[model samples]
Target: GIEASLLTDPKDVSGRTVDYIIAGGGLTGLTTAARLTENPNISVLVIESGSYESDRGPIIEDLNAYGDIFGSSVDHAYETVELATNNQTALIRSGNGLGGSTLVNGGTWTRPHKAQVDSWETVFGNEGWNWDNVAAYSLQAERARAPNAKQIAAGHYFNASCHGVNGTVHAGPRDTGDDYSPIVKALMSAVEDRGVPTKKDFGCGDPHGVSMFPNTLHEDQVRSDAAREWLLPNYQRPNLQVLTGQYVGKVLLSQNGTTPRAVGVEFGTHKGNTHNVYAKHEVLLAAGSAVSPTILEYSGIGMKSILEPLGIDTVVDLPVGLNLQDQTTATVRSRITSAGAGQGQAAWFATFNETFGDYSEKAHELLNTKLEQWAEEAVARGGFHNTTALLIQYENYRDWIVNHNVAYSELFLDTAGVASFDVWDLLPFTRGYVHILDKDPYLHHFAYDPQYFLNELDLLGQAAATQLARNISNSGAMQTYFAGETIPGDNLAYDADLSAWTEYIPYHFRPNYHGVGTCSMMPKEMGGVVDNAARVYGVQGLRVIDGSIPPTQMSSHVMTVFYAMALKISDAILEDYASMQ
Candidate 1:
């Protein structure tokens, strides 16, 4: 999606206001503007804090340079308050430029788990936002290149019919040659011995088995991020404008019968001129999960208590920055003594039963009976959401996860001589909040605690996945390769007591960087700030279409899910204003 008219000066957009003003030039915002500007009369302006990828240097375009891009100029690594459980401060990494986090994140193009989004209907009461639609919408968003003959034989299988052939975001395996390397076969064998079946194409729908992953690695092995896919293409559209290296402060609103209408946005460049860009029709936030809520908080749309303390007048007083959710990962390392062969693309997604056998029953009880207590503690400790509505979310979790089954643990292994292992909590139950600590937009004035492991379920899930990683490292072919055990201990039993695993949990986890739902898309009564249409609850002509809108999470990485949501919401906005264009 392109045609931003590619403006070089912010003054160019001073009166160049259009039908839509989308804040943040990443995947969602960029795509929305791309699609909306398709109709010439439907003009759009995308305000991005980052510059063009061309100016961002080679680290962004190269496919293998993802790790090196961190801490570079483009990274907006936000610091968080120390987690009391471990006394460690976390630095959450997100891209600062036009492409948002997509520029810095691992290029994972996984399809969302079916049961996860299907529950969005029953849980969040979102009609047509189920798996069927997600499947349809996501397929339309991806332009997938199939795995070749040799790659398939090497275990990179996917559904040919399921992949989108005519979409913008092109996805394929990393390499064209047969990569039947050592650690790949070793990891697969470890899963087979444990009775886990290898799911042919985890990207189709189900993510509950051992599988290989495909990435958004485009032609010539280049990174096909949002800026590349949507922004860079078709930049000739005169109706669209992209103001780069500019920051959007807050939404400018007008009062109409106690209903706030978003007229425009207060934005400017870093240490530069302040400008108010008007939106003729709508304003949307494509800022990532963590930043969108901060924008809302700055707009006076957050909790009255939080905004009042900061001396900002409250606008809607919704729980705009509550229900902060994120994923966590624990690492397992070992020394590789010998080598077999397979590939490096394999991974595993496991369910509750696979994570905790007999202990799963107790977890079911916690989801069923501890709702009242969880809600009480959540509100009592800084979260400002309604208790009655908060309790219903646990019931939603029980119905979708406990009654139906979804993966709680995600595992990945990387190898050489000194091999590294990854264990991810697909969706942690621990809840946290982030808010703007002051009024200044330029300063980093936010306070966040993800309250790491505030819930026992998250701790147990991570510990279980860590234990599973150990099992793979200690099992048949791979176990023999390990010169010795590394972290957690030596020769720890795979089925060891919870006490043995819990002790190491607090010290060994990192944010999976899949944070979401600060501005949840549940009912207003459910402490949500947005409706199913992706519109902010009490604000007219304003919506938040980003990772922050998902009330719950899926079994895989969140980019494609956010992509589908962005596409779907963009189409809906068009339909509602059919005559405008």
Candidate 2:
């Protein structure tokens, strides 16, 4: 329980301070604090806006229970302000608590495909971003759990050699009992018949064929949150002082006059009282993509255009909140009668490309044009020289995806009474902007206008993805147990066009909540807020070590990569310390 004075109504304490002050208490913030506290010398303090049990944790747990439900107060559930492009009804949602979105996300632990990382280096001009560097960090951060018997039977296995054996995070396939019904068996056989080999373990890496994706859950009590798994375990340490119910208003800048340096942070209490928390060594920002860049700009550290508009003084003059890319997910749900099927396990996942036919071809053609437009926007807004190269790299990957054909397969099994298929466009060429709307530090007012599906190509790509999801449901193997398409049925047709399908089906165009690239760790010349080591550009004693620092979007789930990046940043920090000593 919180001290009486700390509570809005009165707990115990008055006004106190600490050494290292962390802003948000979400996954990125919690993980960074945990890693920082690992050093016995630092007295770290973490501030969370919402408490763990106050409608946040429960909401996420329920969402994870069956992977349904989108709009809930438990979710940040942010909606766009409406743009005049591609159907108009575009909205996105993400969690605002300690676990971040991890509490509600489907447990799919995917690493970045090597080619994806290589492209990042080639386009953004970063070095040592190859698979070798990334894999080393991934292995270090993950403590892979062996798949259960049912998981093995369901084709979700892990390679012991490539994974960490005793890491804090638990990941593996779920254990549904021997009563794994006939319908599930039929679905499995159908995918296998389509030439998609069911692997003994798909979580060990190389996630291609359909298989069960593991989560960041700690199976002992079913806690799948980054904070619970990574932070709470070490909260008892004397060096760590986690302060709940505080909102960091902005970062405090040093009095350098010409080139300002980051000093600490200014925050507000639950009752609207304010205070400043100083850091002797460094102040790390891990508040996530949407908030991190806005925090920087609000604190006087973004491009002149963004900073001047908000009446804030410019400090670094870097394009802070640019190059934002996120996936739009469309779900197809149906009611199922599982006498014992209700106990089959919860939901199955699948990955397919557009090369399956005309749908694929159309998506590719549209994406080409979308990518070019997106790149042009980035260059205009961010002034990055390599924007064209980055767009080309993404286009090349999409082209490859369009030409490559793979057989459909069942990725997961829903033990509950619902069968659903969720397919995402891995890469969208459209770029968006994130900025603070007001200078009022306490208000939670910000802008996340991504202009989603601004071009026809983006809509076509998403439609193709939707088509792929529909095809999976209709496959001969799944027909035995799988009912007809739950969403966007064959007869609910909308003008027989992609735009009409997405426009009317607003529920289908939900975001994946995997925000990134706001404070990307590229180079100062390339519109990066931080360097390769995640140190903020033009500022000493400041760094950003979270998903926001992810130079590019990875092909796999964000958590595993988030953990790997955290571990890698920790190493860099320690190495820098050692070099100084």
Candidate 3:
């Protein structure tokens, strides 16, 4: 078994130099290392802050069991600042181990809309980042399995061409019992009757419909995380090594050069001693959305004012922790007398038009009119140099959601006899930031604020989604199972006015836990922290291949995109080093 060791192990890697030194041995780091190690000539090392979970047992393996590990040793359990609406701080959950959030996330895996990936090219001015290339890489990283015979016979459908038979990450249906079959069938019918179409497979680039999306699960009914799929399988590779429980303090840069070049990384040991590990080719940062920017800022790569105030010298002076975005979720709880049976079997994706009818046009118009103003405000708050490029990127996203009919809302059906419909505004216009308030690298108590519902459209979109959820609960087939709305209750009518709905949303909503864009992949002029190649701007031999590089948040769960992006960036790194070989 190729299990990771602590940095204190002198026999393995105390002063060893590797071709690539990756920070954070999560999905991106493991996938990139696995791919790069295939060359045999390239030696890759991954340093993770958390311990291996080999002995964690069924708590981490059970696909149906999630959030059970939260607040435990395996979870980061980072808390956010008091939000504007609630005036209460919320717990932000991110996995702390080698597999990252995949160790705890509900294994729902689905691809983003084609427009969502295509917009990356328009925003970054990179032809290599279009949907076609991303989709190809996504297929290359996916290991999809068809559902069991009983599931298929019970009306589950899949688009054969939309899946790949051979890849590291496995995606398949959960072993659901026949108890929830009636509820699933009823819900599907109710959604269709409301004019929302049902797709056989939502993973085929278009997800503006209801479907049973697959989960990242092994055939043995265990959660298939990156460590299980990519790293553990290839642990015997001589060129690859993973070191756990090593907290990277900062990236060490060579200041002698005209431009800063990442030479290595400085990590802290459990005994409070620090050691430096050098990289011959590159130092990759895959520390994920929450912590990647924190590392960059600690390395003096963020806003000058922020770094200088903390007594840290500025290095790159980029907007490292800006443009942070996450989906705003609101749960519409309903009482279903006959629904308490099994795990969730189906979910849905819908656009504004599908739910709000003509109001969709007004929502789009409002977003378009206020986008520039929003960009200017974000730029000022983030300490960005300019807003022109940021505005252009916002316009691109507006087109994707409004004109192209990309899914703006996602609904997760948590069917227990008393159903809780979890709905989220997928494309939020609000931007936030995360930065370290204290100077101690070992004590990771950072300030995180998502500025939830800062933009009015976020509230509107969520209100519409809530209404849609209620509509389905009261619809033809689904109405049979529904007793009534329980959470908000009769005090708040199902058809409440927009003002009432707006007021109700903030009180009940929670962060979707799908944060991204801290180190966005775009041109430097566009307030981007990283370029399309995942390389940090103004820094050489350093790249960030993780959830932090997505320019904007996507409608689907981020693990699938993270895996594909890692594969794509790994190929790019291999190609760049091919000549050297």
Query: Candidate 3 residues 12-120, lDDT tens each?
Result: 6767799999999888988898999998989888888786774478789886676789889888888998877689898888888878888888898888888888878
Model 2 TM-score relative to the real fold? 0.86
- Give per-residue CA lDDT, model 1, range 1-581, as digits (tens): 33244566778777556778998998799888888888898878888888776335558876556678888768878887888769899888888877788888778777767888888887788888899998888888888888777666656778877788899887888773434566666666777887877745877777867777778878666777888888787577778778887888888889865789988988874434677888878999988888888888888888888899888899888888788888778877877664533335567788777777667787677767877887777777655467777777766666657766777788876653455677887877667889999876656589876777877777877887788777777777677677665765554544577667777778767887878889899888778888888999888889999888899877888777877888999988898667444
lDDT of model 1 at residue 520?
Answer: 90
Best by TM-score: 3
Give the Å error, residue 535, model 2.
1.3
TM-score of each: 0.93, 0.86, 0.95
CA deviation > 4 Å runs, candidate 3: 2-12, 269-272, 339-343, 383-385, 490-495
Superposed model 1: Cα runs more than 4 Å off? 1-8, 54-58, 176-178, 256-258, 269-273, 337-343, 361-365, 416-418, 486-497, 579-581
How big is the positional error of residue 445 in model 1, measured in Å on the Cα after superposition? 0.5
The lDDT for every candidate, in the order shown, is 0.78, 0.61, 0.80
The backbone clash count of each candidate, in order, is 7, 19, 2
> lDDT winner among the candidates?
3
